[model samples]
Target: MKDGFILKKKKIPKNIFRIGNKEMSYSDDLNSLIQSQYVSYVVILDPNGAIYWTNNENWQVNGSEVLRQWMGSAPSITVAGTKFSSFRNEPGVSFVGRNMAGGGLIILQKAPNGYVFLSWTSHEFLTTSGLPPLNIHAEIAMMAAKFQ
Candidate 1:
C-alpha cells in the first residue's frame, strides 16, 4: 500500500495451480480459512506506473467450487530472507533489498508514479531465531517515511 502508487493486476498472473507447490485435490480450504498470520495486500511496481504484481486476497469463500477454485492453489507470497526466492527473475527488474529492524526485507525500486511495497508474507512463522517477525502495520508507516 505504498502511497502515490496505483494498483493493477495482470489478466492472470501465473495461475495458482500452475506455479503453486501443493496439489489442488489435497490443498487446504483457502476460502473458509482467514489469513491470520503473516500476510500483506499490496502491489509491486516498475518505473512509471507499470504494475509488476498485486493481490488483495479479496476473493470470498462460500463452500462453492468456484470460490475454492479461485482461492485454492496458493499464489506466490512474500516473506523475509531467502523465503522470497520465487520472486527472483534474474533478467527482469534490477532492484535492491533492505532489511527491516523487525527482521524482514523490503525490495526497493523506483516507480514512475510513485513507490510500491512488495512485502514477503509467505514464509512467515510465529517464531524465528526466538524473535517474531516485524509488525506489518507499523512497518508500512515506517516504510512510507523510510522510502519516501
Candidate 2:
C-alpha cells in the first residue's frame, strides 16, 4: 500500500434526472430540449436546489441564485462559459440582452418539478460566432408552458 497516501478523486453524484410520467416526462422533455439546440447549455435544478442534470457534464453552476432572482432587477446568471444580463420578459421566463463582453442570452424557466436553465452563445462579440439562431425565446417559452 505504498501508494496509499494518494486519495481518490471527488465523485459527482449520478444524475437523478429520469427518476419516475410527469416526473419522467418532465425530465425527458428537458433532455430533448437541450439536445435540439445548437451550442446551447443547460443547468436544471430540482426543487431542493440540487442539480438534477446538465447537458455539459462539466456544468456545476447552481440554478438557485439565477432562478431565485429573475423577478427582481438586473438578474444575472453565469453558466457554461457565458454570462448573461438576464431580463424576465414574461412571468416565469427569462433570457435576453448582451451586456457582458460575452454577448449571449440565457433562458431560465420555472419547471413544475424544478428550474430550467438554458443559454445560447452569439458570435456577435467574436464578431466571429455572430448572431444566435432565431425564435429561441418563443421556443423555450412554449416548452416551459407544457410543464404546467
Candidate 3:
C-alpha cells in the first residue's frame, strides 16, 4: 500500500468498521478499499452491469443500465438512490459521484477483468481539525491504477 500519510488518517467510523469487517471480503481486494477510512462501501459490477461482487449486498441496483452510462452514455449514473458523477474522462475510470449533502465521494474504476471497483469516500476537514491535508485525488488515482 502507498504511504497515504499525506492524507489525514481520520478514525474510521464504527459504522464503517462494521461494514468493512462484517461480510466476507471480496478476496481482500475489495476489503482493502473499505479499510481506507474514507471508503464506506464497495459495490462491484461487471461489464453487463451485474453485481458480480460487493461488500454491500444490502445495497442493490440493476447495474446493466449503470454499465452503459459508464462506458459512453453519460457523465453520471445513479446507484440505488444515490448518484455518482465523473466530471472528466480518464482511462479505465468511467464516472464516479455521490450525494451532495449526506454522502462521501462515490468513486468507480474499471478493472482489468471487466469488473468495476466502486466505493464511496469520506474525509476529515484536516485544517480546521488541525491535521494534514488529504491527497484524495492522488490516492484515488493510485487506487484506480491498482484496479486496472
Best by lDDT: 3
> Residue by residue across 1-148, what tens digits does model 1's lDDT show?
6585333433233324322232232212431111323443334344333333434332111112211121222222222112222223211121222223233433322322344434333334323311553344343334433553
Kindly list the per-residue Cα lDDT of model 3 for residues 14-131, writing each as its tens digit: 1221222235455477666566654556666655446666565455434554444455444445555444555455546534454443445556666545556566555342222113
C-alpha lDDT of residue 123 in model 2:
44
lDDT of 2 by residue, 37-136 (tens): 4435545566655566654445445566445444444344443433455444554654563436445555555664455545443344333223454445
Candidate 3 off by > 4 Å: 1-30, 45-50, 61-63, 123-148
- Which candidate, 1 or 3, would have the higher TM-score against the true structure? 3
Sort by lDDT, best first: 3, 2, 1
**Candidate 2, poorest ten consecutive residues by summed lDDT:** 16-25
Each model's lDDT:
0.30, 0.48, 0.49
Instruction: Tell me the lDDT of model 3 at 38.
Output: 47
